Amino acid sequence: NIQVVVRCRPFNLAERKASAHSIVECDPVRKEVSVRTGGLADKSSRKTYTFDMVFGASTKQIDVYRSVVCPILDEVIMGYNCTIFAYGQTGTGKTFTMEGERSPNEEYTWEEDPLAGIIPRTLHQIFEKLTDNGTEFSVKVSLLEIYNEELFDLLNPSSDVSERLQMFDDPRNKRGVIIKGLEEITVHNKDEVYQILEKGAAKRTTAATLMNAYSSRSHSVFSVTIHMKETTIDGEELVKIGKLNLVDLAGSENINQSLLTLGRVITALVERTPHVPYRESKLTRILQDSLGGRTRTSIIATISPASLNLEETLSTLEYAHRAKNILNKPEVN
Ligand SMILES: Nc1ncnc2c1ncn2[C@@H]1O[C@H](COP(=O)(O)OP(=O)(O)O)[C@@H](O)[C@H]1O
Ligand SMILES: N[C@@H](CSC(c1ccccc1)(c1ccccc1)c1ccccc1)C(=O)O
Ligand SMILES: [Mg+2]
């Protein structure tokens, strides 16, 4: 049973300039989201949905991390494979939540930036939790992006972001794949983190100037792999592996093969259709095990609070709510 949560961003300055009204109410306690749907015609009308967790407009980055990620990171350290992906309309906060942003000027260090998202906070915790705990461990990260069914490597040594990756079925996993050419960087300590992310963002910036509407049409896949040593009571040394995939999806409002097959894959699972079209898109092949497989999965549905985005917001809520019916069978590696 996959976890689905909703995060509503606060109004932006443009919306206030236009006197935007709010049509969203979040109730963390009852874990519900209620939408005002009749504007001027019917003031009482509304659509209420129930999710595993709800975060209102005032929710801060650190709140999302403590509530959603902490539990997931524990599962990863326990030797599980987990996936968190953001789904939502362009401009609602997918990237802001998954990666976050850097505060202007010095002001804050990357480890203390209030605006930092899930990726930076997670990599920081991995080193903090595992170091102040003993345990021999090694951390490896990768960041690829899908655009028009083509795969680009943001952490690759080559200076040209357009050099393409390839995908193949993983011989040792019926529902897993191998990314040929992918650069998996070993992160020796937290002091090596920021440089890797900074290089990553730089190559992404170059890619957005190379392809049309890159930022909103692409899918971003960040993966973290942890190898940890365990010694049984008998003195046997073995290695448990934990893996975390942090995915920032293309805008739902929508080169659309992956987003399209994703919806198709979800529908097939909730309706129990015989054949699930995983093979039909680069995205669903990478996430196959996350959708009905052995990976612990959580979805963060992002929405705007404005009356103007009513239709899309309802669409996002409806889509994410169906997703609650997808069942997975988590299994340690
Ligand atoms: N919780 C939030 N608090 C403040 N601003 C937010 C929040 N969520 C999103 N934003 C704003 O929305 C904009 C980014 O949205 P964005 O990350 O591009 O959404 P997405 O990646 O789905 O398009 C940013 O300019 C940021 O200021
Ligand atoms: N959201 C920003 C990146 S924020 C990011 C980052 C986070 C994850 C992966 C790569 C970069 C960053 C921004 C600018 C320079 C370096 C890194 C970031 C933000 C806050 C703390 C750590 C990393 C973007 O879309 O460009
Ligand atoms: Mg984005």
Domain residue limits, the chain: 1-333
Task: Determine the straight-line distance between the first and last CA of the chain, rounded to whole angstroms.
Answer: 19
CATH superfamily of 1-333: Kinesin motor domain (3.40.850.10)
CA dist 20 and 218 (Å) reads 29
Ligand 1 nearest-atom number relative to CA 216 = 23
Ligand having the closest approach to the CA of 97: 1
Ligand 1 contacts CB of residue 304 (under 6 A)? no
How was this model experimentally determined?
X-ray
Structure tokens belonging to residue 216: 């909103």
Distance (angstroms) between ligand 1 centre and the Cα of 251 equals: 12
Q: Is the minimum distance from the CB of 95 to ligand 2 under 6 angstroms?
A: yes
Ligand 1 contact, 90 CB (< 6 A):
yes
Residue 181 Cα to ligand 1 midpoint, Å, equals 32
In the block, which residue shows the tokens 């990768």?
Answer: 142
Q: Which ligand is nearest to the CA of 218?
A: 3
From ligand 2's centre to the CA of 196, what distance in Å? 10
Q: What are phi and psi of 36, to 5 degrees?
A: -75, 120
In the annotated binding site, the residues are 88-95
Q: Which atom of ligand 2 is nearest to the CA of 115?
A: 20
Q: Which of 6, 7, 9 to mutate to test the pocket of ligand 1 (most atoms within 8 A of CB)?
A: 9
Ligand nearest to the CA of 56: 1
Experimental structure resolution, Å: 2.5
Cα 96 to averaged position of ligand 3 atoms, centre (Å): 7
Q: Please identify, by atom number, the ligand 1 atom nearest to the C-alpha of residue 86.
A: 22
